[PDB]
């Protein structure tokens, strides 16, 4: 329900020069995931693939992990745990790995780990960090968001932030970045609309 704490959202590139990257996908009607650099905001469709790129200047130590966590973007809602609405929580869309209440899933990684924090009650999802493939400059993780922003009983039209943290095997934070998310039926159109408020 309510958490007694709120995760920090402060960008931290750290010693390994950690940044996020996104595909430059544009805003055509078919696009299922598109990122606004001006808004630092991902627009994506429910349950579709959202590529998030990890960029580092140097290789993290062995055993490093990558955690994703959602919080409400507006400070007034930040103590409220981000979770799926009742409708989606009960629907039959289980992949056999993710808890039904969790908003954020990782796709295509059998080493995915999900956490219900016993103290803060927040949900998160973790994968081992892996260096880029040969000929590549970044590591891609495929996320899925399993509720719409408009889902009542869940996000209730409230914007969220995804916080990505790079975590080492001794408990230190190696890096952190974040981006706003809107999960919606028409990411391309919605991105143009929201960017129109600029200019």
């Amino acid at each position, epitope marked *: 329900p309510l958490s007694s704490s709120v*995760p*920090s959202q402060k960008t931290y590139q750290g010693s390994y020069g950690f940044r996020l990257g996104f595909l430059h996908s544009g805003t055509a009607k078919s696009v299922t995931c598109t990122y606004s650099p001006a808004l630092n905001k991902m627009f994506c469709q429910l349950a579709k693939t959202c590529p998030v790129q990890l960029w580092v200047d140097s290789t993290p130590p062995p055993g490093t992990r990558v955690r994703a966590m959602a919080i409400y973007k507006q400070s007034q809602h930040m103590t409220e745990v981000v979770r799926r609405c009742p409708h989606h929580e009960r629907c039959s869309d289980s992949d056999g790995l993710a808890p039904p209440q969790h908003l954020i899933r990782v796709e295509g990684n059998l080493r995915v780990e999900y956490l219900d924090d016993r103290n*803060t009650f927040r949900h998160s999802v973790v994968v081992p960090y892996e260096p880029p493939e040969v000929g590549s400059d970044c590591t891609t993780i495929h996320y899925n968001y399993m509720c719409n922003s408009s889902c009542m009983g869940g996000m209730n039209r409230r914007p969220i932030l995804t916080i990505i943290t790079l*975590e080492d095997s*001794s*408990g*230190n*934070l190696l890096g952190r970045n974040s981006f706003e998310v809107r999960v919606c039926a028409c990411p391309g159109r919605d991105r143009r609309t929201e960017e129109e408020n600029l200019r």
Partner: nanobody
Amino acid sequence: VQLQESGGGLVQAGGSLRLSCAASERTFSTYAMGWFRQAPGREREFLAQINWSGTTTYYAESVKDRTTISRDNAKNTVYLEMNNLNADDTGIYFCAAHPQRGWGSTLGWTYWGQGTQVTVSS
């Protein structure tokens, strides 16, 4: 980077100790922290570790039942609480930061505090 412990001093037998450690710099909130103690004659001993966010903790088995480690990153401070103290709890208590050799080790810590004396007395 520059660690300071507080809360030491005389403690009644059966009472509890409440220590804290804070660093001056914003890099504190990215570091796991640890608490150690060293009794006269004996080697330095691991007590508890907590990760950068405070969500994850680990205790030495010998003190686990009556020890709590916590932190407040807003205030850049980590806390150690230990209950039901006895004579063998007397010693110098150290705060350390940025472990590089995993969980519950005495080696591999980048920063160390100067330590605070705790004396269990009747």
